[PDB]
Design a binder for this molecule. Structure first.
Ligand SMILES: [Zn+2]
Ligand SMILES: [Zn+2]
Ligand SMILES: [Zn+2]
Ligand SMILES: [Zn+2]
Lengths: 149, 76, 86, 76, 149, 76
């Protein structure tokens, strides 16, 4: 009894895959999406392949998808549990946004970290006080966690 | 030259641009077609969030490249 | 379903960005964006003030009273209902 | 025909950068601007006499713009 | 150098004539219209053919046409000079109204006098205090003035 | 049976009616089609301003008759 929007979105996803982003439904669940995002070019995450879980709650699109990193990542706006602090996933969500544009937005977030409002305070602090170190750390973690995974 | 912009719904609009056009000019063209002001537009290409001041050629965006439209986002 | 050929290229302009179907009793925000009355109702019933345009985040300090856009209704009605002669 | 749906009730030409009032009626931006610039408060919808105690700010209806644009570009 | 609306309107007027209403521009003036309206059915003006002048001022369509009876008529809302007191001809005009709908409106006004707010005070008074006589007079004047020309 | 209503712009809409329909009913269909509330509608036929309570057949309005739409008018 899937909403027609989600059906459509899924079809378009399959037919119109975005480069740098893979998203497929679970054979056991049309609302569960296995995601893989490429680290943005010229970011510390370049060359990485990050697994994410995207989930469509019953109230979608009136409420945002639930999105979580499943690959470990060093980012001021992502905690040790992969939870993502991004406004379009809560207060600044819009029902005109879609799976595609949310995933693109998360990719954009990787390309553009924000330490001044932290989710992971330790990481954000490190990103503020010693940006080079934080970048090198992020690249290191990308190698360790997000390559050959 | 022409480029493509994939709008929020997925429908793709085509834009007449020059390689010397800034992301801002592009945003203005998108605004003309879609009524979304530039401060609310974010354009993704090859996973980067393009910067208003930079041009299409700074990013190596060539004819029939596709740019993906997204709304203003803020990591917290 | 089938549609009059010359009207087929309108399919994407004439689809609601919330439900992705052809507008149903569409309504137009002052910022110039169109939604099925019901889709927008649902959207802005979900939240309280301030109410934001799904498409451009234009801010309304109260729910604007909006009536259906009859031109767009009728256009959509043509896109759907127009057939060849039998 | 929709050739008529897509024509402005003030200028009787195809909508040019049409604008949609909260009462759901459409006018070329310029035609409505002229109509309500002519007067002071209260401002009335030319089509239904809906009363606005102040002039509502409106942006163009991009869908309707594009539909007319398609209509016209196809005609040529 | 006519504004395009007036050209179109005139064209539509000629091409799509409304029954009971004649309106044609003066060959020496595109803004001056010689009008003839039939008295409405079941009115005291029935069988009448009333000549009117309709004139498009420079501010048209932002302002109403100037419309004047040239045939004498007995009506509480029309004076001895043929001037018409009708709200759509002044404050409640709309740029969506047109020659056609103005003339139709005047025809409707003939079909539905309003003595309670008078232009011709004597006539309106007569119409309130002695409606039958006023009606018979209207029919009489219709016969005497509007069954020729 | 069908009838026609000529709207303000000159555009003609067609209406599905029964002869037993009131003018109010017609106004409601017009409101559905045109977004103009019935209290602001006036329908003219044979120079008469039709009355809300009467029916289409009370006026001898038959198939393919045309009614002409007009805005609320008041002689003063
Ligand atoms: Zn919808
Ligand atoms: Zn908007
Ligand atoms: Zn216009
Ligand atoms: Zn209106």
């Amino acid at each position: 009894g899937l909403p027609r929007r989600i059906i459509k979105e899924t079809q378009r996803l399959l037919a119109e895959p975005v480069p740098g982003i893979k998203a497929e439904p679970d054979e056991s669940n049309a609302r569960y999406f296995h995601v893989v995002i490429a680290g943005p070019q010229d970011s510390p995450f370049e060359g990485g392949t990050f697994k994410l879980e995207l989930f469509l709650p019953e109230e979608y699109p009136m409420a945002a998808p639930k999105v979580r990193f499943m690959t470990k990542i060093y980012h001021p706006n992502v905690d040790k549990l992969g939870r993502i602090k991004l406004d379009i996933l809560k207060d600044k969500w819009s029902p005109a946004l879609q799976i595609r544009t949310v995933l693109l937005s998360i990719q954009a977030l990787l390309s553009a970290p924000n330490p001044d409002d932290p989710l992971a305070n330790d990481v954000a602090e490190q990103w503020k006080t010693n940006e080079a170190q934080a970048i090198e750390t992020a690249r290191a973690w990308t190698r360790l966690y997000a390559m050959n995974n | 030259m022409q480029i493509f912009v994939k709008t929020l719904t997925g429908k793709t609009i085509t834009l007449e641009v020059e390689p010397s056009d800034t992301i801002e000019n592009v945003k203005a063209k998108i605004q003309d077609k879609e009524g979304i002001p530039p401060d609310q537009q974010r354009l993704i290409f090859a996973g980067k969030q393009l910067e208003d001041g930079r041009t299409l050629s700074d990013y190596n965006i060539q004819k029939e490249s596709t740019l993906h439209l997204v709304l203003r986002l803020r990591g917290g | 379903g089938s549609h009059m050929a010359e009207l087929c290229p309108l399919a994407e302009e004439l689809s609601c960005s919330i439900c992705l179907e052809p507008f149903k009793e569409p309504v137009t925000t002052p910022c110039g964006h169109n939604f099925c009355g019901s889709c927008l109702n649902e959207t802005w019933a979900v939240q309280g003030s301030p109410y934001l345009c799904p498409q451009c985040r234009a801010v309304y300090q109260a729910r604007p009273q909006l009536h259906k856009n009859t031109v767009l209704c009728n256009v959509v009605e043509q896109f759907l209902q127009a057939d060849l002669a039998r």
